[PDB]
Scaffold this motif. Structure first.
Motif, PDB file in Angstrom:
ATOM      1  N   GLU A 158       0.827  -1.197   0.000  1.00  0.00           N
ATOM      2  CA  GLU A 158       0.000   0.000   0.000  1.00  0.00           C
ATOM      3  C   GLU A 158       0.861   1.246   0.000  1.00  0.00           C
ATOM      4  OE1 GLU A 158      -0.192  -2.409   2.238  1.00  0.00           O
ATOM      5  OE2 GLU A 158      -1.940  -3.478   1.467  1.00  0.00           O
ATOM      6  N   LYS A 159       1.805   1.319   0.930  1.00  0.00           N
ATOM      7  CA  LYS A 159       2.562   2.545   1.111  1.00  0.00           C
ATOM      8  C   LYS A 159       3.309   2.918  -0.158  1.00  0.00           C
ATOM      9  CE  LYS A 159       6.170   4.510   3.969  1.00  0.00           C
ATOM     10  NZ  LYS A 159       7.306   3.996   4.776  1.00  0.00           N
ATOM     11  N   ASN A 160       4.056   1.977  -0.728  1.00  0.00           N
ATOM     12  CA  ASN A 160       4.789   2.282  -1.949  1.00  0.00           C
ATOM     13  C   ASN A 160       3.845   2.646  -3.082  1.00  0.00           C
ATOM     14  OD1 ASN A 160       7.371   2.187  -3.586  1.00  0.00           O
ATOM     15  ND2 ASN A 160       6.079   0.726  -4.683  1.00  0.00           N
ATOM     16  N   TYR A 161       2.712   1.957  -3.175  1.00  0.00           N
ATOM     17  CA  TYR A 161       1.743   2.230  -4.229  1.00  0.00           C
ATOM     18  C   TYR A 161       1.169   3.629  -4.102  1.00  0.00           C
ATOM     19  CZ  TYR A 161      -1.920   0.807  -7.535  1.00  0.00           C
ATOM     20  OH  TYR A 161      -2.720   0.644  -8.634  1.00  0.00           O
ATOM     21  N   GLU A 162       0.677   3.968  -2.919  1.00  0.00           N
ATOM     22  CA  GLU A 162      -0.021   5.230  -2.749  1.00  0.00           C
ATOM     23  C   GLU A 162       0.939   6.405  -2.661  1.00  0.00           C
ATOM     24  OE1 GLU A 162      -4.044   3.828  -0.611  1.00  0.00           O
ATOM     25  OE2 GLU A 162      -2.319   3.908   0.719  1.00  0.00           O
ATOM     26  N   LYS A 163       2.182   6.174  -2.243  1.00  0.00           N
ATOM     27  CA  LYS A 163       3.206   7.199  -2.411  1.00  0.00           C
ATOM     28  C   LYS A 163       3.465   7.462  -3.886  1.00  0.00           C
ATOM     29  CE  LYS A 163       7.007   6.533  -0.300  1.00  0.00           C
ATOM     30  NZ  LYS A 163       8.077   5.796   0.403  1.00  0.00           N
ATOM     31  N   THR A 164       3.648   6.400  -4.668  1.00  0.00           N
ATOM     32  CA  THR A 164       3.860   6.565  -6.098  1.00  0.00           C
ATOM     33  C   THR A 164       2.699   7.290  -6.749  1.00  0.00           C
ATOM     34  OG1 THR A 164       5.301   4.644  -6.320  1.00  0.00           O
ATOM     35  CG2 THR A 164       4.078   5.327  -8.267  1.00  0.00           C
ATOM     36  N   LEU A 165       1.479   7.076  -6.257  1.00  0.00           N
ATOM     37  CA  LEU A 165       0.347   7.871  -6.719  1.00  0.00           C
ATOM     38  C   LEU A 165       0.504   9.322  -6.309  1.00  0.00           C
ATOM     39  CD1 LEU A 165      -2.725   5.593  -6.079  1.00  0.00           C
ATOM     40  CD2 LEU A 165      -1.830   6.274  -8.239  1.00  0.00           C
ATOM     41  N   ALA A 166       0.951   9.564  -5.081  1.00  0.00           N
ATOM     42  CA  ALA A 166       1.162  10.935  -4.642  1.00  0.00           C
ATOM     43  C   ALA A 166       2.248  11.615  -5.459  1.00  0.00           C
ATOM     44  CB  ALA A 166       1.512  10.961  -3.161  1.00  0.00           C
ATOM     45  N   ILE A 167       3.347  10.918  -5.734  1.00  0.00           N
ATOM     46  CA  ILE A 167       4.402  11.515  -6.542  1.00  0.00           C
ATOM     47  C   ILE A 167       3.884  11.826  -7.938  1.00  0.00           C
ATOM     48  CG2 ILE A 167       6.662  11.170  -7.543  1.00  0.00           C
ATOM     49  CD1 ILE A 167       7.061   9.183  -5.081  1.00  0.00           C
ATOM     50  N   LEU A 168       3.220  10.856  -8.568  1.00  0.00           N
ATOM     51  CA  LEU A 168       2.789  11.047  -9.944  1.00  0.00           C
ATOM     52  C   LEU A 168       1.872  12.252 -10.065  1.00  0.00           C
ATOM     53  CD1 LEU A 168       2.262   7.438 -11.276  1.00  0.00           C
ATOM     54  CD2 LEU A 168       3.522   9.214 -12.415  1.00  0.00           C
ATOM     55  N   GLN A 169       1.031  12.482  -9.062  1.00  0.00           N
ATOM     56  CA  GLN A 169       0.168  13.653  -9.075  1.00  0.00           C
ATOM     57  C   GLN A 169       0.989  14.933  -9.029  1.00  0.00           C
ATOM     58  OE1 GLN A 169      -1.832  14.672  -5.479  1.00  0.00           O
ATOM     59  NE2 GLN A 169      -3.786  14.987  -6.511  1.00  0.00           N
ATOM     60  N   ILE A 170       1.953  15.003  -8.117  1.00  0.00           N
ATOM     61  CA  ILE A 170       2.782  16.198  -8.007  1.00  0.00           C
ATOM     62  C   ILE A 170       3.507  16.460  -9.318  1.00  0.00           C
ATOM     63  CG2 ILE A 170       4.871  17.055  -6.950  1.00  0.00           C
ATOM     64  CD1 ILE A 170       3.829  15.696  -4.347  1.00  0.00           C
ATOM     65  N   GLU A 171       4.162  15.435  -9.851  1.00  0.00           N
ATOM     66  CA  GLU A 171       4.900  15.587 -11.092  1.00  0.00           C
ATOM     67  C   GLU A 171       3.987  15.933 -12.252  1.00  0.00           C
ATOM     68  OE1 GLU A 171       8.750  15.535 -10.024  1.00  0.00           O
ATOM     69  OE2 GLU A 171       8.051  15.559 -12.098  1.00  0.00           O
TER      70      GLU A 171
END
Ligand SMILES: CCCCCCCCCCCCCCCCCC(=O)OC[C@H](COP(=O)(O)OCCN)OC(=O)CCCCCCCCCCCCCCCCC
Lengths: 57, 63
Positions: B4-17
């Protein structure tokens, strides 16, 4: 009955009364172009920081 | 941690980028319009200060 004006009297600035209307556009100027509209709002921090290449902050 | 953590962080990063990428493209479009049209707050180029025009009555009438 004529009295000679003293020294300095002919150079005074007097007020003259007349019924002629005051011109309102003596220069025949057009309408001044509009100013660029101002932008309203308070400052907020820049979204995601400087957004400079790979820098995060 | 779990995936979960890696997945939803990667979602958070992708949004920022992704939001950054659209702002960068939007700034080029904005800067292209303000510069070419001069109707925006940027690229305002100076014109003579009108406060130094002499408005007094002159030595001659036609002015
Ligand atoms: C000696 C031999 C080793 C050579 C090392 C060569 C280093 C080259 C560095 C090139 C620039 C990369 C670092 C700049 C950067 O993007 O860091 C941004 C940093 C962001 O802050 P940070 O906590 O690191 O992560 C985000 C949370 N704020 O915020 C910053 O700007 C920190 C800037 C200082 C970087 C240290």
């Amino acid at each position: 009955g004529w009295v000679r004006p003293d020294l300095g009297q002919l150079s005074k600035v007097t007020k003259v009364k007349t019924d002629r209307p005051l011109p309102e556009n003596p220069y025949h100027s057009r309408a001044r172009p509009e100013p660029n509209p101002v932008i309203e709002g308070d400052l907020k921090p820049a979204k995601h920081g400087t957004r400079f290449f790979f820098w995060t902050v | 941690d779990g995936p979960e953590k890696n997945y939803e962080k990667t979602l958070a990063i992708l949004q920022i980028e992704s939001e950054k990428a659209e702002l960068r493209l939007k700034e080029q479009e904005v800067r292209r319009l303000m510069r070419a049209r001069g109707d925006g707050p940027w690229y305002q180029f100076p014109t003579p200060e009108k406060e130094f025009i002499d408005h007094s009555p002159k030595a001659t009438p036609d002015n």
